[model samples]
Target: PKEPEQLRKLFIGGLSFETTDESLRSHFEQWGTLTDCVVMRDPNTKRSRGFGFVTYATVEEVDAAMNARPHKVDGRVVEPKRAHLTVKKIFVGGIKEDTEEHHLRDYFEQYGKIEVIEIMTDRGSGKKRGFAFVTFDDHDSVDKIVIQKYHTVNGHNCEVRKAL
Candidate 1:
């Protein structure tokens, strides 16, 4: 939103614990024009506690589906691995396993120069699957915190998206 390089969105983690948001928008719509493909469930056993979120529409079709190639869907091969890919990175959410990285850099540094934050834990009980990763050197100050939707931290409910 607000044209932060217009780089759509993506932030899907190692899913497949029953991944199904209409089959992940029909397997990521063959990697293109997906206004949104979600899979963060468990509102009382809705399932899919793996990870998900996709929003593509532009930014060169999200860098051609982030350099597309691997895509197997239900058979599990969907690794869009562009690790440090950035559009001034911004994919935060909740984050509360003692939430390090300077507390996600003081909560996204009030939407400014954060550089990097990354949290994503639980490598065998590390805890903190509350999601995290925030970087900002530009992209219009993280696109103003992805157009601000209450942007919480300890209160657990934040989503600024874009990653794969």
Candidate 2:
């Protein structure tokens, strides 16, 4: 049997186009104390990305919210699900095709304990698609990894960013 998952965050999708950060926070505040609420937006246009995240301070609140189904805000039907916590994960892009999981781990092991490393592959070619996701046990190590955002391996320069 598997242990129950933690409920620190929530993913709210199918947001109304007019939704804003303040509106999202206000709506969810009625349900529980929200630690954070974000309405994702485009960098250039600043338009809502049609999705957002809401974080509760406790698991109890999350449970309550989940049980209260058929959620709607701003007159639009929205979907809510437990958000997968990825604070300790980082995205690595521009990975070389020949790079293996061990090599990827070796490069990041100096920072901290790595729990998992996944290198993406192209479905058609069956070769590395030049990206990977590395998860660490310690969240603090993410800060260090972020500092060294660029890496060189197998003649390719990789870019690192926090996984959304």
Candidate 3:
């Protein structure tokens, strides 16, 4: 698995309507390799919405880009915000075969808003592999869950840890 994409991305605002994806990339590529870059546009006419995104290869690059202050392109000083996604994935082991997806969701709901709950399956047998991956809306929630790390779901013991 790779580092989550959401953390490395930044929001761009106040762009000149004439800004193109290539030019926006040209501006930020000075910091580091851009994994992705785009200018948000109106779909109907494909016109610029004066907003865009820049995704550097590392959060390190993102920080350097932010410290540069207001960005200018096409004669407009654009706004860049640290609007990174907070979702954090956790690993759930020792899950019983009977523990369905919703069971994990309902149990973890006490700690955070649930974004995703997926059961790992075995390719050979096409059955759940006794584990699940859970995604919480924010890091704080994951911290809470990790604090109460040992859990009893459906009277079965399960182990929870921050996903590597």
Candidate 4:
């Protein structure tokens, strides 16, 4: 089998633990020719990791698959999104544990128009993780925020950096 040129890949999530490569490929093949399809698995148990990746031969296929009807494997609806290498966002670390989305938004809104504010939380406890990703409307806003990279919020010092 030949490799697809200019491969376009997506992160597939919400996969069933029992889902297999063949099942993923068959379900996504309707969108376009797949260059690669994989269901991540654990080495010890060799069981599905509940997430995987799909690669299409071209951007057209990637677009089609993303725009096509909702996808599911093993009767569980899956969420697929284009895997981007870089993002126009900022990472704020050392956030006060008590800080919430509104506080972050209020703090950064003055710098520019915020597109989104995502506060990292503990998956098990559902508590803030003292970090967040803030997306701005433009690079100018990012620059503006970076001007004062060190911030003190709610008596806690936070460091800001560009998102990779």
Task: Assess every candidate by TM-score.
Answer: 0.23, 0.47, 0.50, 0.49
lDDT of 2 by residue, 10-54 (tens): 788899989899998988887778888999999999999999999
User: lDDT of each model, Cα atoms only?
Assistant: 0.67, 0.77, 0.80, 0.78
Model 1, residue 27: C-alpha shift (Å):
16
Worst 10 residues of 2 by lDDT: 1-10
Q: Indicate the residue-level lDDT of 125 in model 1.
A: 92
Residue-level lDDT of model 3, residues 94-157, one tens digit each, is 9867789878988998776789898999989988888999987665466556655379886779
Q: How far is 51's C-alpha from truth in model 2 (Å)? A: 0.2
lDDT of 4 by residue, 1-164 (tens): 53344347877889999889999999998998888899999999998889999888876687677666478778999877664333469999988588888878888887667999998989999887889999987554565456453787666788988886
Clashes by residue pair, model 3: none
Clashes of 2: 0
Measured by lDDT, the strongest candidate is 3
For 80-153, candidate 1 gives per-residue lDDT tens digits of 43213336887776665656677667767765677777788879997878787776766545544665557767
**TM-score head-to-head 2 vs 4, winner:** 4
TM-score top scorer? 3
Ranking by lDDT: 3, 4, 2, 1
Model 1 scores a TM of: 0.23
What TM-score quantifies how close candidate 3 is to the native fold? 0.50
